[PDB]
């Protein structure tokens, strides 16, 4: 009956059958019970879109169109969620924010 | 050659959605894949230890919104299990 | 548990400035901007700018840019706000409320509000004052000048009191609010329904959006039961 995906069905754009099938063949328990890759997809396509949206924001402000991984570091480190989230993380070419401390500044 | 697989088209049709008029750039596509990548191992493994902690064989989608709320800080947590309930019900409601 | 607690009303002499207070409690404070909400009977609800005390990190209407100051100081825990040129038409109730970093997050708690008296995209809201029943369907329409990506709230607030947060996302019912009150729509047509009405309903209710930069809250529906 012209075969419809699972992300169609749960009304999602990341693939709930590849994460089903990573989830099976990772190694993580003896079976999945397939409303965790539904689960599991969404809360990845959630996480994506913040991280997307913010980032698309931060290259608005600096007036670019494309997404660089400056756009990402500075839309990751100004969100203490996000920083907390990815605290040990290194985002390659990312740099740093700008920060300068107070008694370091003349007068 | 062999096939390897990303996450490039979803990231992108995600970034449409939410930015119908901005694009992406091969690096920070590497850096969305590998984001999608280990947090796929973060919940995943969280969820594998839910379910060797309780005596289960198996990861429902109770395991993974456990997982949620423990790796993910305070309204990120909320509105990703807002997020995968949504689906769940949906995908539940609709074959 | 959480709470925004502010100070009492100020009678202000013209030309000088006045310094408001949002002592909080209740929540890790750094992880939420505090939002500052003005109110007049004649403009309603104006967004005038918020605080992130993560990176002290200000944004402000364009309006209130160089009037209105924000500062924040993680000790006290408080957010203070700074009005310096007092302007004739200053007097007015002025909220801080809490909303997380988050898109989809709102202004989900309010303060109670200081009464301060001197000596973009626009929401259409259909009816302006309606009368409903102890029992009727209750339709109220915000329909929006641009497109959002359904970053649209619904909020409720009774005379003389802060405003409750009903609906957030424009569907999603917020936190202890009943399941009576539905939000509907997307894009630019939004609407919020009250299904069984009580005596507690008698309120005014507003939509606002943060889908862009200026926030803006709508023109408001009185609705009053019996």
């Known amino acids: 009956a012209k075969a419809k995906s699972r992300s169609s069905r749960a009304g999602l754009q990341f693939p709930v059958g590849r994460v089903h099938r990573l989830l099976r063949k990772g190694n993580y328990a003896e079976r999945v019970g397939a409303g965790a890759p539904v689960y599991m997809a969404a809360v990845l396509e959630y996480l994506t879109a913040e991280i997307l949206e913010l980032a698309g924001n931060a290259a608005r402000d600096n007036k670019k169109t494309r997404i660089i991984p400056r756009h990402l570091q500075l839309a990751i480190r100004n969100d203490e969620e996000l920083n907390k989230l990815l605290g040990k993380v290194t985002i390659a070419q990312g740099g740093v924010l700008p920060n300068i401390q107070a008694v370091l500044l003349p007068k | 050659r062999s096939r390897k697989e990303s996450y490039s088209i979803y990231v992108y049709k995600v970034l449409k959605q939410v930015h119908p008029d901005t694009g992406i750039s091969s690096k920070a596509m590497g850096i969305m894949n590998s984001f999608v990548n280990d947090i796929f191992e973060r919940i995943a493994g969280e969820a594998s230890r839910l379910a060797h902690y309780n005596k289960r064989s198996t990861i429902t989608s109770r395991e993974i919104q456990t997982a949620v709320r423990l790796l993910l800080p305070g309204e990120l947590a909320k509105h990703a299990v807002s997020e995968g309930t949504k689906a769940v019900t949906k995908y539940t409601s609709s074959k | 548990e959480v709470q925004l607690q502010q100070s009492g009303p100020e009678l202000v002499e013209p030309g000088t400035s006045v310094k408001m207070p949002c002592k909080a409690s209740?929540?890790?404070?750094?992880?939420?901007?505090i939002q500052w909400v003005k109110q007049t009977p004649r403009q309603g609800l104006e967004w005038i700018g918020y605080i992130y005390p993560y990176n002290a990190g200000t944004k402000y209407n364009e309006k209130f840019k160089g009037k209105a100051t924000l500062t924040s100081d993680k000790s006290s825990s408080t957010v203070y706000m700074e009005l310096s040129s007092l302007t004739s038409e200053d007097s007015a109730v002025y909220y801080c409320?809490?909303?997380?970093?988050?898109?989809?997050?709102?202004?989900?708690?309010w303060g109670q509000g200081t009464s301060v008296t001197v000596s973009d995209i626009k929401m259409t809201q259909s009816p302006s004052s309606m009368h409903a029943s102890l029992g009727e369907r209750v339709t109220i329409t915000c329909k929006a000048s641009?497109?959002?990506?359904?970053?649209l709230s619904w909020y409720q607030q009774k005379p003389w009191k802060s405003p409750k947060t009903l609906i957030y996302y424009a569907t999603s019912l917020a936190d202890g609010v009943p399941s009576r009150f539905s939000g509907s729509g997307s894009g630019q047509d939004f609407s919020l329904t009250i299904n069984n009405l009580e005596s507690d309903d008698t309120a005014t209710y507003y939509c606002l959006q943060h889908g862009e930069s200026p926030y803006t809250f709508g023109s408001g529906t009185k609705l009053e039961i019996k």
């Open positions: 209740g929540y890790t404070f750094t992880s939420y901007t």
């Open positions: 641009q497109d959002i990506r359904s970053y």
């Open positions: 409320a809490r909303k997380s970093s988050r898109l989809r997050s709102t202004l989900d708690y």
